[PDB]
């Protein structure tokens, strides 16, 4: 149930979300990839008085330093292919 916790939190309102483009995404819109969580937990999120969200970027900054100088897992799910997927990303 750690795929399923990771959409509830993706699909809660409307809001601001985190995505992973690729070098061709801005040129070609036909892959659309959410970032869904960070080293396998949900992207932590804040839900406002009027049922919109925004990330916890306190956090968020916390689960990046602990990666300076290292590699952070970003968890994706794709929207369209449906798919989870790990990507990696070096955090100066
Ligand atoms: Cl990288």
Not at 1 to 15: A, N, R, Y
Request: proline content about 4%; overall charge negative; aromatic content about 16%.
């Amino acid at each position: 149930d750690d795929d399923d916790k990771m959409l509830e939190v993706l699909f809660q309102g409307p809001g601001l979300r985190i995505v992973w483009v690729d070098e061709m995404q801005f040129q070609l819109q036909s892959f659309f990839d959410y970032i869904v969580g960070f080293n396998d937990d949900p992207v932590p999120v804040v839900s406002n008085q009027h049922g919109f969200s925004y990330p916890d970027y306190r956090r968020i900054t916390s689960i990046f330093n602990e990666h300076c100088g290292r590699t952070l897992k970003v968890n994706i799910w794709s929207a369209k292919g449906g798919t989870f997927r790990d990507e990696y990303i070096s955090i100066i």
